[PDB]
Amino acid sequence: SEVAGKWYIVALASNTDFFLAEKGKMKMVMARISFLGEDELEVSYAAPSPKGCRKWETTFKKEVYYSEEAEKTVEVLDTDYKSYAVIFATRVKDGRTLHMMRLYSRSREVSPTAMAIFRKLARERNYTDEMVAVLPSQAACSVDEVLVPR
Template identity: 55%
Template sequence: MRTLELSLGLALLCLLCAEAEDPGAVGLDKNKIAGKWYIIAVASDSESYLRKKDELKMAMATIMVLGEGDLKVSFAIPTPEGCKKSEWIYKQTGVPGEYYCPERGNKTAQVVDTDGKTYAVIFASRLKDGKTLHMLRLYSRTQEGSPKITALFKKLAREKSFTDEMIKMLPRQEKCSLDEV
C-alpha cells in the first residue's frame, strides 16, 4: 500500500512539469492543478500492487502550490485498515517534469496526457530493491471519468506495456476523504 501511496502523490506533482519549462506544453498553470483530485484508475507492474489491487478503492488528493513552485500534497487513501491520511511537500528536481519528496526517496513522474481541467494521466517510476517499478494513474476532478477518458487511459496503459491484469478502474468510495483546503 505504501508503494501505491508514494506513487500516487508524486504523479499529481508532475501536473506542473511542462509549465515549469514550457508554459504551453500541456496548457496548465499552477492555479489549474491546485485543488482536489480523485485517483480513479491505476496500472502498475509492482508485485505488491498486483497482489492487493482488488482491495484498492478510489483515493483523493489535494494540491496547494507553495512559493518557489513547491507543492503541498495531502492524501486520503482507503486501506483495509482504514482511511490513511498524509501530507508531503514535493520539490522540483531541476529536470523539466520531475518532482521529488526528500522524505520519500527517489521517485519521478511525468504527465502523459491531460486537458488541464478535468483529467490527467500520469506515469511514475521509482527504484525499489534494485528494481524499477512503473505506475500509470488516471486523475479526475470528479469521481467518475467519462468513457472517452477511461478508454484513453486503457489505451495509454497498453502502450506502456501494462497488461489488462495490471489495469484497475478503482471503485468509488465515500468513507475516506480530505477536508476542503
C-alpha cells in the same frame, strides 16, 4: 494554475505481484493539490485500507516533478489541466525501482475520454488489461479541510 484543489485517483496500472494480488481490494483515492510558488506542490491523499483511512502528504518540486522524501519521480503524460491527468510514477524503495501509472479525475465518475487516453498510454508501456484497475468509489476516507492561520 487551474490544477489546485480536489482530485480523485480513479485508475492505476502496474505489473507487481503485490498490485496484481491486491488490486481487487483497492479503492479510489482522494487527493488535494496545493501550490507553493512556481515549482513546488504538495499533494494530500486519503485512501481506505484494512488498517483504516490512511492520510499522508507528499511534496513535489519541478512536467517532471520529484519528491526526495519518497524518492519518487512523477511525469505528466497527458492532461487538460481541468478534468483529468495521466501521471507516470517511478519510485526507488530499498534498491528497487517501482513504476505505476495513475489517472487523476476531478469527478469520481471518470469520463470515457480520459479513460481511453489512460488505457492507450498504459498499453504503450505494455501494461495488459489485467494490470489496469478501475478503482471503486469510496465515501469514508477524505482529505482534511485546510485551516489558514491569520
